[PDB]
Each structure stands twice: as C-alpha cells, then as structure tokens.
Task: inverse folding
C-alpha cells in the first residue's frame, strides 16, 4: 500500500471535520492506500496574534477521536511542545514533527517513546543527507542497538521522513527530486504536495505536477491538506486542495506506481 | 553605545564560566559597549543523543546568577519553551528567541510579557521583510496600541532583531547585507558573527570579515560565541572565538562605527 495522509490544515469545528471526513471516504476505502486523516489541534506559527489557533490539545484530541470512531479512520496530528506526545498518541496513529523542529532532539525522543509512527518533516534549510541523524535519534529511542538508519529498519520501527521542499532564495521553495532518492536510503519517504509549493507571485496549481514527479522518482506516500471549501478555510486556503482535486492527484500517483 | 553579547555556547561548568567571564572583563569595562554575558542552559538541536546537553533551566540559571553577582555582568540566555520565560527573566536581562522558533507566537508572547529585552533571531529560512510580524507580536504584547513595528518603538520597548545568515543551497549560510538595512527599519539589529559563517568545504576564519562588513553597513550590536579554549569546548570549538580574537574584532568594529 502507498500511504495517503489527507485532511484540513487546522481543526475548525466538529462539523467541518465530519464534512471533510465524509468527502474523503472514497480514498479511505481504496485497497491500494494506507489512509490517515490529518488535522492540527494548534497553529503555533500564524502571522498575527488575532489569527485562528485551533481548539488546542485537549479539545482537538476529543474531536479527532470522534472522527476515528465515526469513520474508522487512522489519525495523524502534529506536536510542537514537550509533554504533548504521550497524550496525543492515545488518539493519533502517526505523530508528526514539524519541519522547523526536525533537529530538535528532545521532541524526537519524546515522540519515539510513544507507540505512534513518527513522521519527521525535513526542514526547508536541511541537507537531505543530514536527515539520517534525526532518523537515528528516533531509531535509537525505539531500539538502542541500532547504529545505522536504513529504510528497512526505519520501516520496521515506524520512523518516516517527509519532503516539503527546500528554501530557494526568499519566499520560494523548490523540490529537489534528488532528495527523495537520498532520504529513502534512510527511511520511507512521504511527499508533502501542499506545503512544498511556494512561489513569488503559494500557488496550489503546482501541487499536482510535483506529486506526479515525486511518484515517478519513488515515494512511499503522499501528504496533502484538503478542505471541502478552501476559500472558506481558517488556515492555508490558498494551498489546500478540494477532495476532487486530491482524488485526481492520487489516481495519477497510483497509475505511475503501477508501472514500477 | 554599541551592544556586545558574548560568552560560551553552553554552560559547561561554573569554573569554565568564571574563566571566560574573567577573560571578557576588558570588553565588559569598555566605555563604548553595552555588554551582556551569554550562555545557554540547554542545547536542543544537538547532532547526537549522547552529545552534551547542558545543566538545564534550574541549575543553569543559578550559575548565570552567580556570574552576575561575581562580575557585575548583565546576562543573556535563550529560551525554547514558554514556561521558561518567567523564571529566566528574573536573572537574564535579555531573553533570546532561537532562530528556528522566530515565528512561534506563544513563545514570543510569553517572553514579551516579562521585563526582559527580547532578542528575536531571524530564521535562516525567513525573508527579512517578514521579521516585522515577529517584532509586531512582541510590541503588541508590550503596548496593544502599536499597529506597525518601527526602530524607535522597538528600541523603546526592548525588542531587537538578530541576523544569523540565510540558507544558500545545502550546508551553507550567506549573509545578505541588505537584510541588515531592511530589518533595521523594524527594530534594532544585532549581527551574530559566529552562527552565520558555515561553508560546505568539508568556518570561524570568516567571523571577523563579516563583522567588519556588518559594522560598515550599520548595526546596533554584535553577538559572538567565545571560549577560553575552543578545542576543549563541549559545543562546538570550530565556531567560537578566543577572547583575544574577539577583542581585536570589536576594536575594528568600533573604529568603523566611529566613521559614520
């Protein structure tokens, strides 16, 4: 199975979560996919003090648990701070470490101490080669005998890497497709199609093109933020896909992967 | 008065702290400087699980306080979590936000609620124009009537920006000297001479030259990691200046600043 992680940027309300969960039911039911439903309980990095932050740890977790029970979905959420991981892991099947915390050893350790799959997002500032050290920190936490991070050992112990592009001047990200190959020597690689676009004069219309490229290089899965009505989303409305758009991207991924 | 922040990367021992504090005394007594002694109580992005981490918040702050009492030095320390801000500001005159956390709202808020000067390091992934939003979060916490960050308002309310370079391909930082000018419209600017040098060849030799360039452009201060014996430093050794090397550098920057 190829992994598909999909859902809204942030938890906006239980009824929006149900609405997107419903629209994702077809992808969730697809035999070729290992599906996880995603939603952040807090947006720590917003541009303004007034910006919507999410329901927070306790309330957001209750809502995601509701989705898990009503739709039967496995759950992914991100953690930003100490003492969140153990609480979140009771609900979340995957715990994601955000790109800017990708070298934060205490957080890597804390998450790897839970039963969750660890998804480590590559910082836009990182050499892909250097992500091996983040993987090894997680692997040593689960199995102290491990000395070298490799794909099979990382797969076995539930430690994955996620590509979201690299800084390219100011306010531009580029996806170095070579990074998918380099990183996959260390761990299963998920491609983040929605946060890897940013261009001066950002534009989600590139997300499908990058996803197709990525699938052709070789990836273990796809991460894409999706929302039933992006123009009325509370965060990242410009980059998020509608469910129909996501379905096209996934269809193309599967057709490419079925060649190789 | 130009600001000088200097000290070891991490607190190694009380004896090491006193040794470096002693050696910095000529600089601390320089009439032309507003001097702050720096040391980190934890290193969170260390490459290895076994790598030295520091004494931790409680013991770290005790040690910094001993230096303040024994040498009469103002103190800078970095915080990584919101709960640290309150207690650290009882000892530290400046609280620095790490570069990788420069967009973290809750952290910026909690630090700005203290009486400390706030020094916000610019992430190597940021457009310098976008640092105005971090400054504004800090300023609105100190004075809700502020709508836009400017140098004078930031100076008045103890909010500064710190340049540490920008990512330039893999494993390389470049200092865009234009960023010093751009950021100084929003807040006073400190140049970090020692964290902004990295070069993909296999270095501290460039710290002096970048510091002179920054002084010529126009800065409010210098930040530099310094250690009595770099090759025996717990972190890292290759980056830090010896006290004598720092003294020559500060001498050149003051000479340059006196021209303009």
Result:
């Amino acid at each position: 199975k190829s992994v598909l992680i999909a859902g809204p940027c942030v938890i906006e309300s239980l009824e929006n979560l149900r609405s997107i969960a419903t629209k994702l039911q077809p992808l969730a039911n697809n035999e070729r996919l290992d599906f996880y439903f995603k939603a952040s309980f807090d947006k720590a990095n917003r541009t303004s003090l007034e910006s919507y932050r999410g329901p927070g740890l306790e309330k957001g977790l209750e809502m995601l648990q509701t989705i898990k029970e009503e739709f039967g979905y496995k759950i992914l959420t991100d953690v930003h701070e100490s003492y969140q991981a153990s609480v979140a892991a009771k609900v979340a099947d995957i715990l994601q470490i955000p790109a800017f915390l990708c070298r934060q050893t205490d957080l890597i350790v804390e998450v790897s101490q839970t039963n969750a799959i660890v998804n480590i997002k590559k910082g836009q500032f990182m050499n892909p080669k250097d992500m091996q050290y983040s993987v090894l920190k997680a692997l040593k936490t689960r199995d102290k005998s491990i000395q070298s991070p490799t794909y099979e050992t990382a797969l076995k112990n539930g430690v994955w890497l996620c590509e979201r592009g690299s800084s390219f001047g100011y306010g531009n990200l580029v996806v170095d497709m070579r990074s998918l190959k380099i990183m996959r020597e260390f761990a299963p690689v998920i491609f983040d199609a929605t946060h890897s676009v940013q261009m001066p004069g950002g534009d989600s219309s590139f997300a499908p093109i990058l996803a197709r490229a990525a699938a052709a290089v070789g990836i273990d899965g796809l991460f894409a933020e999706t929302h039933v009505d992006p123009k009325n989303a509370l965060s990242d409305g410009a980059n998020m896909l509608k469910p129909d758009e996501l379905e096209q991207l996934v269809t193309d991924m599967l057709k490419i992967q079925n060649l190789f």
